[PDB]
Symmetry: C2
Subunit: 155 residues, 2 copies
């Protein structure tokens, strides 16, 4: 069932993952699935980390990530980054399962309460900060966004 | 008036600035003063930025920072970073006033509503993250702390 459509306008703020996922996430959620072909660059690896921080801060014990393995220069940090996130989650009693596919195109987030969130840009919807010390560098509610569509579904 | 003493134990979590300053910061606060000799290094400048993000997200219009200039070459990066924070604040309609003193030793945060918060380590009370991609790297509520005392005062 298609439940809602949220339009994130160009340069819009108030879209941290905490703000965006709020309505669909509650204490009953114990398992999460994320399909995103673009978790390779530093900022994309940190976006996934912040998504995991939100889920554990909330009773998630299992996170599944389906992504594409980087073929080039990003491969080393992508591997080191994803293994570090998995080890940090393990230390929190959380299982992270990473699967790779070069044939993935869909961007989909699924919670075991039945909610599904499809973002056009996946988790990678923020613009680069104006500077190294600009407001919104750390608090993503103050970070301007790229124009994107968020589609909400329920099982 | 000395109001309360909060002991931050070694390796304690749940101490982001948002969590720590919650009880003393409300819609009525329009002006903030911070005295901290250690707003020099990249991590200390980011600490100050996250403190400003919290105040701006509340109707704070004026922020005063009294700090110490680093004695060495690090002063170039501290001065540049502080100017970047001031320009980002300016763009948000917020005035940041930075003053430097080689004779300041006290750590004191003052809100216009009468509340005063003195942290032993100032804003710089977090431990280094376990790894580059560990939970708590971005969300400070998951970041382990150094042992410190927080003293609360009211005018
Ligand atoms: Cl976020
Ligand atoms: Cl970023
Ligand atoms: Cl913080
Ligand atoms: Cl009060
Ligand atoms: Cl840090």
């Amino acid at each position: 069932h298609h439940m809602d459509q949220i339009k994130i306008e160009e340069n819009a703020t108030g879209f941290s993952y905490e703000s965006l996922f709020r309505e669909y996430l509650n204490e009953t959620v114990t398992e999460v699935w994320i399909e995103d072909p673009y978790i390779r660059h530093t900022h994309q690896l940190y976006n996934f980390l912040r998504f995991c921080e939100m889920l554990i801060k909330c009773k998630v014990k299992t996170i599944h990530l389906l992504t594409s393995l980087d073929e080039g220069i990003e491969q080393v940090q992508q591997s080191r980054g994803l293994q570090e996130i998995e080890e940090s989650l393990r230390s929190h009693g959380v299982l992270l399962e990473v699967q790779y596919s070069s044939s993935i195109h869909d961007r989909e987030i699924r919670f075991n309460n039945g909610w599904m969130i499809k973002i056009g840009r996946g988790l990678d919807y923020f613009k680069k900060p104006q500077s190294r010390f600009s407001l919104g560098y750390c608090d993503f509610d103050l970070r301007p966004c790229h124009e994107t569509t968020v589609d909400i579904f329920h099982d």
